[PDB]
Amino acid sequence: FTGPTDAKARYMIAYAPPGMEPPKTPEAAAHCIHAEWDTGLNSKFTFSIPYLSAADYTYTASDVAETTNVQGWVCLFQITHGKADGDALVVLASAGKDFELRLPVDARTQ
Amino acid sequence: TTSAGESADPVTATVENYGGETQVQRRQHTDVSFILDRFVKVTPKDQINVLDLMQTPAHTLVGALLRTATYYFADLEVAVKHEGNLTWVPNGAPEAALDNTTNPTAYHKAPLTRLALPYTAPHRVLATVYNGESRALPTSFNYGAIKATRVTELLYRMKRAETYCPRPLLAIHPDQARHKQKIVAP
Amino acid sequence: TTSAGESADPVTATVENYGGETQVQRRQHTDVSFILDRFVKVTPKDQINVLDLMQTPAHTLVGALLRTATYYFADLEVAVKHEGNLTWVPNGAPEAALDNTTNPTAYHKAPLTRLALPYTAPHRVLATVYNGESRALPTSFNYGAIKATRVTELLYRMKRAETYCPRPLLAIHPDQARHKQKIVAP
Amino acid sequence: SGNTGSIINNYYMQQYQNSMDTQLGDWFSKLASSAFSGLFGALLA
Amino acid sequence: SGNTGSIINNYYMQQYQNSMDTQLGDWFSKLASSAFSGLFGALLA
Amino acid sequence: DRILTTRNGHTTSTTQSSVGVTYGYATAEDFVSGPNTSGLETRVAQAERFFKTHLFDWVTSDPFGRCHLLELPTDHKGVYGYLTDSYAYMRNGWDVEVTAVGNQFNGGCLLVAMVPELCSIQKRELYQLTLFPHQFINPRTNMTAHITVPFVGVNRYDQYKVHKPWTLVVMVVAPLTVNSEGAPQIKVYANIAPTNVHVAGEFPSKE
Amino acid sequence: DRILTTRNGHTTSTTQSSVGVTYGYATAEDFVSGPNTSGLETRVAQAERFFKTHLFDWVTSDPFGRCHLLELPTDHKGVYGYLTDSYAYMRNGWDVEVTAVGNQFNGGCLLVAMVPELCSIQKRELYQLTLFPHQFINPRTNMTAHITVPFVGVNRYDQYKVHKPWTLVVMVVAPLTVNSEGAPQIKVYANIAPTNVHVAGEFPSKE
Numbered sequence: 011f012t013g014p015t016d017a018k019a020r021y022m023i024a025y026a027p028p029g030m031e032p033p034k035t036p037e038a039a040a041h042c043i044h045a046e047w048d049t050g051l052n053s054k055f056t057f058s059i060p061y062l063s064a065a066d067y068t069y070t071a072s073d074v075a076e077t078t079n080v081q082g083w084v085c086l087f088q089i090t091h092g093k094a095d096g097d098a099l100v101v102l103a104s105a106g107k108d109f110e111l112r113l114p115v116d117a118r119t120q
Numbered sequence: 121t122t123s124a125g126e127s128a129d130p131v132t133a134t135v136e137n138y139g140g141e142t143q144v145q146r147r148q149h150t151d152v153s154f155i156l157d158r159f160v161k162v163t164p165k166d167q168i169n170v171l172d173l174m175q176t177p178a179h180t181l182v183g184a185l186l187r188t189a190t191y192y193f194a195d196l197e198v199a200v201k202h203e204g205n206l207t208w209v210p211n212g213a214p215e216a217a218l219d220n221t222t223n224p225t226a227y228h229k230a231p232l233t234r235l236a237l238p239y240t241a242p243h244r245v246l247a248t249v250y251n252g253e254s255r256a257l258p259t260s261f262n263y264g265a266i267k268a269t270r271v272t273e274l275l276y277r278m279k280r281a282e283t284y285c286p287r288p289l290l291a292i293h294p295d296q297a298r299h300k301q302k303i304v305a306p
Numbered sequence: 307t308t309s310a311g312e313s314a315d316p317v318t319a320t321v322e323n324y325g326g327e328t329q330v331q332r333r334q335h336t337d338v339s340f341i342l343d344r345f346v347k348v349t350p351k352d353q354i355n356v357l358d359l360m361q362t363p364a365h366t367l368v369g370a371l372l373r374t375a376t377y378y379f380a381d382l383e384v385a386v387k388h389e390g391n392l393t394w395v396p397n398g399a400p401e402a403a404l405d406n407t408t409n410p411t412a413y414h415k416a417p418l419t420r421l422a423l424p425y426t427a428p429h430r431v432l433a434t435v436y437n438g439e440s441r442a443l444p445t446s447f448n449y450g451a452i453k454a455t456r457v458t459e460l461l462y463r464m465k466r467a468e469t470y471c472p473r474p475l476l477a478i479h480p481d482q483a484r485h486k487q488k489i490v491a492p
Numbered sequence: 493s494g495n496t497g498s499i500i501n502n503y504y505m506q507q508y509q510n511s512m513d514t515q516l517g518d519w520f521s522k523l524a525s526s527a528f529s530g531l532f533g534a535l536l537a
Numbered sequence: 538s539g540n541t542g543s544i545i546n547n548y549y550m551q552q553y554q555n556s557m558d559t560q561l562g563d564w565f566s567k568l569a570s571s572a573f574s575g576l577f578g579a580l581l582a
Numbered sequence: 583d584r585i586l587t588t589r590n591g592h593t594t595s596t597t598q599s600s601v602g603v604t605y606g607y608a609t610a611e612d613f614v615s616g617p618n619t620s621g622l623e624t625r626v627a628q629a630e631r632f633f634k635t636h637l638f639d640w641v642t643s644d645p646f647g648r649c650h651l652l653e654l655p656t657d658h659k660g661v662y663g664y665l666t667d668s669y670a671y672m673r674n675g676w677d678v679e680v681t682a683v684g685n686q687f688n689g690g691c692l693l694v695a696m697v698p699e700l701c702s703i704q705k706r707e708l709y710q711l712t713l714f715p716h717q718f719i720n721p722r723t724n725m726t727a728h729i730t731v732p733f734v735g736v737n738r739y740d741q742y743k744v745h746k747p748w749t750l751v752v753m754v755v756a757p758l759t760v761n762s763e764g765a766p767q768i769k770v771y772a773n774i775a776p777t778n779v780h781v782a783g784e785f786p787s788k789e
Numbered sequence: 790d791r792i793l794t795t796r797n798g799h800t801t802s803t804t805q806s807s808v809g810v811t812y813g814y815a816t817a818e819d820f821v822s823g824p825n826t827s828g829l830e831t832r833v834a835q836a837e838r839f840f841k842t843h844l845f846d847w848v849t850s851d852p853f854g855r856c857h858l859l860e861l862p863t864d865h866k867g868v869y870g871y872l873t874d875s876y877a878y879m880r881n882g883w884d885v886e887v888t889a890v891g892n893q894f895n896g897g898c899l900l901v902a903m904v905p906e907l908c909s910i911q912k913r914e915l916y917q918l919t920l921f922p923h924q925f926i927n928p929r930t931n932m933t934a935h936i937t938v939p940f941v942g943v944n945r946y947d948q949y950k951v952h953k954p955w956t957l958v959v960m961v962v963a964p965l966t967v968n969s970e971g972a973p974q975i976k977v978y979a980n981i982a983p984t985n986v987h988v989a990g991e992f993p994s995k996e
Contacts, residue, residue: 011125016970018890018932027670027783029743038789040841041867043622043799045138046980048890048932050805051790052577053125056133060140060620062783064671064737065446067428069398073303073445082670082783089841092892092972107134108143111150113396113426114158116406117301120179120292122577122792122803130572137575138799141621157540161407181408195555231413238556275407280539280555286565301400305445306358308532312601312691312718312727316527323530343495376698377736381510424511429736433699436736437653438745440701447736466494466510471607471698471734472520474710501544508542517613578794578803581810592829622799624835628988659994664871781835787866 011049013097020089022046023057028082036087058106152283159275171263189283191245196263197277199234204269206233211240211264218267237263338469345461357449375469377431382449383463385420390455392419397426397450404453423449590775591631599724606696606715606731611675611778616738619782629662629779637770642758647708649753653746662776671739674779677730678750680772684721688764690756691720694727698734700749797982798838806931813903813922813938818882818985823945826989836869836986844977849965854915856960860953869983878946881986884937885957887979891928895971897963898927901934905941907956
């Protein structure tokens, strides 16, 4: 979070597994693996997206046939905010301790 | 896992934070020495070919992946399909040398010649990029040059590769929410 | 050897029951790992060939015998006769990959290429049948895909094969009391 | 082991030959061996 | 070592195979391992 | 007197013709907490309890082969049914108990088998149905079969909304005979219970 | 820096203004398996996890006393809601976390209390509301209250379909002031989680 010292907000981040429509509201998403924080002296907040799949690995690429999203969704909500309007929440992504890639392939990929 | 935002200290947050249990990682396939050790097909000049690594197409695996390092080191290993004899002159050798057979020439044999070349550049480490010039990379940064009556296929392979200071690497930019390419299917 | 009928406990009855003496069995030839380890000829698509094991004809030895398992595991080993270079992309790779030579391509050599492939499917064990759908077996269940300018002959060979939960297997149904096929004779 | 049969040790590592298995944390044989045999009977000479 | 994989020792010396390195007179791994984890928080049950 | 009284949760189910349980495939459920779920799996014990369901009428005109298939898990209105609608991945064994109470003057028998992955069945392969974890129900002897099977499949956990790994399959092997004193028909019911049910990753609310 | 990160099941809820949890009435849940249930009670852990709900807008025109009551358990679409529809008796504590994120230039405060048995409230008795397990939310200091209470009541277990033993009650004690830089309004949400939920005696299916 990167708002002014007088803006404040709560955010949420659920993870909805595949096989149902993703949530449209935080009340609904509350029933997922969510975690929810608020802006303070500490500006950053990290949250691991859990690995959950019936298989042991999961494809890195989408198939042109499949559109229903096989791995499920992440949804970032905004519970409340306090004179925070127009303030940015910059987001970044990395590997966890246990993230791992496998079977190299040159798939054109520019 | 809250933390201070500007610090740029690494903050990994395990799934333990919400119950849950970190699993076992195995990362052999994304080891640099491993992933870079494959043959990559460069499009040759008909006759004289400097053996630059930057000649590799920047989209290809070995291409784009080598480009993440700003400095690298490897021994090379070219596999080239040609007519006539193939002649490799070291690094920093007059191009007129490419004619004298005493230089490590390899006589023709079906259906390709495969030979390992030593790192031979006068710098400690080569570079994928060089701000002497804001293409346009010092001529000294090479593995030598090959010549044949006609080189047709030419393939580079990095051995022992070491890599230093990672530069960005970038996927193909999708238009739809998923880059929905057609996956191999039974 | 009388017993209770509905129990479905195994009841083997030896010839001892009427005098007589059980002999020595040797069963090496009907071991799964053994019997499945042979080359079996699949009829190829001209160019792109997914390496499914279900592509094997269900009458053939390796065919029909693999089909008794509902779940199996093996490492593959294809022997393919082709023109041009042959290129095998792993499992779950865009079909567009089949063009990039950096993927384990094998250059042409008379008179067939024979190479061993690792089990590479994201499931623990593949299946010969799958009731997600009451053909029509998940696209994920494969060993990868090969492509050449023209594959002509293609042969699968299971290595290390493991097999789980036997499903029925069925002989050719005779009309006469004996299926009186013509036996090799001197 | 299977349908392999050479006395010389294999040239390639092992990880480069097969895929390497991974433990985490047979039946029909048992089942066959467990087969009851002989007689429920009170046998006579 | 890399993407090599044979059990037999190599036929050529070593100096004739690779170029030989020379000492005179790793980071990102450390960096990754140094990653702070868990909580700045005073956790509750 | 071959009594056997099972129970699952707060239910039970005595029987005085047991002939005994058959365990199919494995006599104990294997590893459950695997790498694929990040340790977010959890057991839901309250799901494990019996539920009844009718199968068919075994009518005296049924020839050999007249088979009926029941894929599992089925339409289930209780807790185990709700789980299915509120978690994405789950695994459980089954513990099946088919009854066909006729009378001891009836003849002929049914075979009851649990077959993994069964999208319908060829006629000729019914002859080898005894390859799967089975039991006979022959009215002159017993009225009930009892079979227990572990969770099987290509994956540690399943998505039941798209995949039903087991089918219960009751088959007529010798036709029923009413004779003088036997029942005119026999209805066949199943009394099934999930076992060692685990679940992972909860769906957002139905809203 | 007064951080506090709760979690319940696989949910969490950090806060950087904690001021700390208040435990009301008892700092640990008493005996659960009593004589009245014959040992047929069972814990349902999966119920214990947070759920959000809006309370009110704290508008600058709200005078003192403007109270809002939330009886519990409420309309709840998830697991804990299903339990209520599939077991006759149950008991659980609560673990409540009311937030009212304004800004530190707002003034005035709310009081948040968990009151047992509250069918609406007399005005004069709002003055003694601090008898119940409470906490203040004063924007110059904190944004969140946090209160934990045990299961209470005349009975070891309850029938929630006919009796709601707790009410959450948020009250305005000093009115909000927007001043120059404070928020124009403040919406107030609750983030509630059942705790140590036990259940007994399952209803027949909805058929």
